[PDB]
């Protein structure tokens, strides 16, 4: 929603979460699969030099 | 409304601009910030993870 202003003491105003407008959904992160796969493949290729 | 998987309501009383009387406020806090102080089986007596 917003920074709901709640006042404590003489002048201190802290900001806390109000409601949630709409439906709730997950907070996520997205990484491409083929780029991550051949990135791990290249990391394994390079690290196989140090382990025979 | 409905049910949020991560947010508790956590209504608390707080000090107004005068010391004598108290007022009731509310927010919505996240689940990993809220700890159940409990010496019994009480499911509504919660506190912040700060004050320890």
């Amino acid at each position: 929603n917003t920074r709901k202003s709640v006042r404590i003491g003489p002048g201190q105003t802290f900001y806390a979460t109000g409601d949630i407008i709409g439906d709730i959904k997950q907070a996520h992160c997205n990484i491409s699969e083929e780029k991550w796969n051949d990135t791990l493949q290249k990391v394994g290729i390079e690290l196989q030099k140090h382990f025979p | 409304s409905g049910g949020v998987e991560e947010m508790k309501n956590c209504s608390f009383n707080t000090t107004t601009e005068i010391r004598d009387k108290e007022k009731k406020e509310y927010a919505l806090f996240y689940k990993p910030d809220i700890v159940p102080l409990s010496e019994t089986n009480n499911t509504s007596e919660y506190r912040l993870i700060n004050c320890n």
Partner: antibody
Amino acid sequence: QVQLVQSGAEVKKPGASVKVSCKASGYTFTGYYMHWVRQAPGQGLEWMGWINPNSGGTNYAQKFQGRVTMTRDTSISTAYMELSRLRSDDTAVYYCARGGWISLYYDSSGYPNFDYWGQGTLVTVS
Amino acid sequence: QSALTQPASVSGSPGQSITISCTGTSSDVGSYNLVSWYQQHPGKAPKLMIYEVSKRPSGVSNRFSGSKSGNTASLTISGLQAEDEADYYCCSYAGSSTVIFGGGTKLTVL
């Protein structure tokens, strides 16, 4: 195929409460939103809020203020409206429509994409 | 925050291009691209005819084209027959998870 059926026509008195049902058949109803619209006879269309059949989340339009409650059950695949404090202005026809797709990663509630509708219940008051 | 403005009725000969437009504020049409259009026969349930702003659904002949320009969204129909006599409505994403429907037109054939 995909069908939406509702209850019969209901005649009531002012100040009472009306209940309109809507049964969804042909698809998994727990993955789609369901919106409710209102049609007065001879007027346009008015929109009431949506119901999420998974977690029971609701929204409502303005000038209603929680005087209508929408609930659902996952056993018989039927959505429910409980509208209270009836008035002579509320003589209309109520439709239930299928909305967007529940996706767990973005808010698809406000998407005005209504494909399938019920045949509608006529609610008249004296 | 009322309904979207809409003409009361339209008229047109068969084979004549007819344009229907509805106007909204900056928070309804000018900021979100979710503007759909519905028709209904009198006495029957409404039916979807246009997706988000310009896409056509399945089972629909390529005759209804929708477009938007600023705060105005318009639907253009060419090649009209007697089966297009219906009531046409606008809708949009109004923000804060709310949907506002349009006033509605009536199409008269000649």
